[PDB]
């Protein structure tokens, strides 16, 4: 044949699998790691945020970040050879670019990698399910690196591909989108957080209900890689929590499954939520309160008390965070309590 | 019987009582029963609280105008701070009410009985005869809850600033913190968000694989999940055909064949990071806040080049400034 | 009027129902607030 | 408290409609033995 030769080859074992997928996974995924890396080490991000984004500039690990395109570009893919940059790898490196790059090349790495999860999966006679679970991030990364930005003004307001530069991404939401108070995001932490426990527990819950089937102080070797033998008494399980927490994870297909759900699910609920933030559809609102916030100048809930923090986060950062607006806030206009 | 207590003694330690109640049990069981009872009500119907050092009452009861999210039972006031404000030290019942004394009750109580659950978390691993490095997993959790309710308070001197029991309250305790500790830039919290994110990823990983190499026992009409009986002797999954896959999917050797090790990795990762985190709060509890690189990057003339952390800090001031307007009667938020 | 074969029964056990209910009762508890605005 | 008007039919129906589904599907099955 002619195809199958390409197939036959690239498809069989050779340590680091490389498959029909790899063709797009490996290249995109590589560039991507590089894309972010080069920036942090050598590329500046000054011409977009007037902010230093490279070791070379003096930034540290927690400082370095691969900018994000000035609010002058908007959503233009900002092409290396596009009208804006015109294949001028220094200007193109200056107008940020690497972003759309890292992000788009990256966006594939995922598509690509998940595929690989399928390819290797359909080849090894298993349920792809892993590949499914992986939507969990695609949805996030899609919404949070493409959708949200695409919904707002410019690629600018999009994540930052930084360590701290990304923390900014938080606050900025809390401060403007007041995300913290958005149902959807909530399940987002309900799942991650909820799942982590689920993980840390099944992991340990298992370890302890381990049948001494080795000899001595090394229950790590006493396990049989070879054959079927429930290593953790499922019976010593239920009869444990059933009495300590009131409930029993009686079965392992569901246990070892419900663990798939928890996260992946929440993530989606996050990806939805943020989709909201894309079109500024946010949960800041809470009328019932604010309407009665008008009168009764003496009634106060945390909500408001909190909501106020936000209102400060705006007034102070906006001017320097959003430079392209040349904001100007005189000494007076800034909100402050009596004291500082 | 020689003594009637004899039966009380085996009952408490009844290895077969629907719900085990150890010696810790006998304290946990009610410490939380009282703790919960005060709570559930304080939420449903409780007056405002002067919280902050002043006399600005913050309402946090559904019957006083709270959505389930705005809901929260408030802390004790900067007036008491650390002094012990138990129900009797207060004159009128309403005093305890106003000066926010439920908090201490609820907090002190659960925050206590919680630990006993941690003990009775292991007491069953003894009566049941199972390895018990389990109760420890539970630590990380209890540590934090203890950290956010007992260390930080002793740290800043007042129960005033201890994560207020309620939904929107936490959000508050948080945003404030960032401001006074730059927690987000703290190496600890990192290792915290580290595992949590991990565990939440591993929790979906290990759960993913198992169900992915599940095994045979069903039709398409039947629920594949049914293929298993409690008390199976051999596990339902085909571990070999799992590692045989995952291992392959990038590296082959960055994978686990050692089920005992893997399930273990799941334990320790979340449980260890969470600890650092629990310590993170407990660390900044005495003001060893996160990093700080403001103005740390400059050019020749000295004209200052903003670090991407200077924004962090910018948004930080916006926070510093507002929080607790009226009390702060001085230049430095030294508490 | 001849019976179609594909008439398989339906399943939701004593437990799954507890979860199904715990699932709703919760969101209900969560969104209620936002459903009141 | 000035709140939304459908709070009841919204939140409420949200509970009773899906819940009633599960309810049905259970007693529909727990009645295979005619028991229930």
């Amino acid at each position: 044949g002619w195809f199958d030769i390409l197939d036959d080859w690239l498809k069989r074992d050779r340590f680091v699998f490389v498959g029909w997928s790899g063709i797009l996974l490996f290249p995109c995924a590589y560039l991507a790691l590089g894309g972010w890396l080069t920036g942090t080490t050598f590329v500046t991000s000054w011409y977009t945020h007037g902010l230093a984004s490279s070791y070379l500039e003096g930034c540290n690990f927690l400082t370095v970040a691969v900018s994000t395109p000035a609010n002058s570009m908007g959503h233009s893919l900002l092409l290396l050879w596009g009208p804006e940059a015109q294949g001028d790898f220094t200007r193109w490196c200056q107008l940020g670019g690497l972003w759309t790059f890292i992000a788009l090349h990256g966006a594939f790495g995922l598509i690509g990698f998940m595929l690989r999860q399928f390819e290797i999966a359909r080849l090894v006679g298993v349920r792809p399910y892993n590949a499914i679970a992986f939507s969990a991030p695609i949805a996030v990364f899609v919404s949070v690196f493409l959708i949200y930005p695409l919904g707002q003004s410019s690629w600018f307001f999009a994540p930052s591909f930084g360590v701290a530069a990304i923390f900014r991404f938080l606050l900025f939401f809390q401060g403007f989108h007041n995300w913290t108070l958005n149902p959807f995001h909530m399940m987002g932490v309900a799942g991650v957080l909820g799942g982590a426990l689920l993980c840390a527990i099944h992991g340990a819950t298992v370890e302890n209900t381990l049948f001494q089937d080795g000899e001595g102080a090394s229950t790590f070797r006493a396990f049989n890689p070879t054959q079927a033998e429930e290593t953790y008494s499922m019976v010593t399980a239920n009869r444990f929590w059933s009495q300590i927490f009131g409930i029993a994870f009686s079965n392992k297909r569901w246990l070892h499954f419900f663990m798939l759900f928890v996260p992946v699910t929440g993530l989606w609920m996050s990806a939805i939520g943020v989709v909201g933030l894309a079109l500024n559809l946010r949960s800041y609102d809470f009328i019932s309160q604010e309407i009665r916030a008008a009168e009764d100048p003496e009634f106060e809930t945390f909500y408001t008390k909190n909501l106020l923090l936000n209102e400060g986060i705006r007034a102070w950062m906006a001017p320097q965070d959003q430079p392209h607006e040349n904001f100007v806030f005189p000494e007076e206009v800034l909100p402050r309590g009596n004291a500082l | 019987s020689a003594n009637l207590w004899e039966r009380f003694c085996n009952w408490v330690t009844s290895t077969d009582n629907r719900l085990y109640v150890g010696w810790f049990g006998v304290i946990m069981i009610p410490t939380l029963l009282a703790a919960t009872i005060c709570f559930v009500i304080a939420f449903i119907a409780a007056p405002p609280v002067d919280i902050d050092g002043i006399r600005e009452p913050v309402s946090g009861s559904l019957l006083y105008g709270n959505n389930i999210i705005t809901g929260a039972v408030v802390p004790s006031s900067n007036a008491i701070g650390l002094h012990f404000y138990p129900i009797w030290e207060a004159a009128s019942l309403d005093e305890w009410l106003y000066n926010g004394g439920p908090y201490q009750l609820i907090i002190f109580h659960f925050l206590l009985g919680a630990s006993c659950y941690m003990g009775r978390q292991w007491e069953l691993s003894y009566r049941l005869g199972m390895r018990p490095w389990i109760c420890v997993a539970y630590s990380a959790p209890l540590a934090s809850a203890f950290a956010v309710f007992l260390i930080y308070p002793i740290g800043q001197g007042s129960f005033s600033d201890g994560m207020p029991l309620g939904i929107s309250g936490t959000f508050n305790f948080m945003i404030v913190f960032q401001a006074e500790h730059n927690i987000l830039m703290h190496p600890f919290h990192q290792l915290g968000v580290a595992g949590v994110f991990g565990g939440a990823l591993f929790c979906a990983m290990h759960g993913s694989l198992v169900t992915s190499s599940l095994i045979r026992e069903t039709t398409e009409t039947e629920s594949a999940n049914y293929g298993y009986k409690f008390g199976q002797e051999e596990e339902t999954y085909n571990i070999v055909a799992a590692h045989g896959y995952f291992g392959r999917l990038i590296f082959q050797y960055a994978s686990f064949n050692n089920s005992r090790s893997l399930h273990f990795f799941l334990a320790a990762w979340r449980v260890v990071g969470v600890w650092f985190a629990a310590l993170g709060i407990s660390t900044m509890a005495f003001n060893l806040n996160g990093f700080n690189f403001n103005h740390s990057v400059i050019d020749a003339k000295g004209n200052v080049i903003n670090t991407w952390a200077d924004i962090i800090n910018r948004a930080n001031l916006g926070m510093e400034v507002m929080h607790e307007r009226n009390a702060h009667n001085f230049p430095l938020d030294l508490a | 009027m001849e019976p179609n074969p594909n008439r398989q029964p339906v399943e939701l056990n004593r437990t799954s129902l507890y979860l199904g209910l715990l699932l709703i009762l919760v969101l209900a508890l969560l969104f209620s607030s936002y459903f009141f605005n | 408290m000035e709140v939304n008007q459908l709070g009841f039919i919204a939140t409420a129906l949200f509970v009773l409609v899906p819940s009633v589904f599960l309810i049905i599907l259970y007693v529909q099955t727990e009645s295979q033995q005619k028991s229930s």
Binding site: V235 | I68 | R14 | -
Partner: peptide
Amino acid sequence: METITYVFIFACIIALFFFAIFFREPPRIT
């Protein structure tokens, strides 16, 4: 009003704890 709606949920749920723990489908060792 709406605060009963909150308390009604809150409660019927504590009772979904009742049944799911005490009238829960038991683990059959076979």
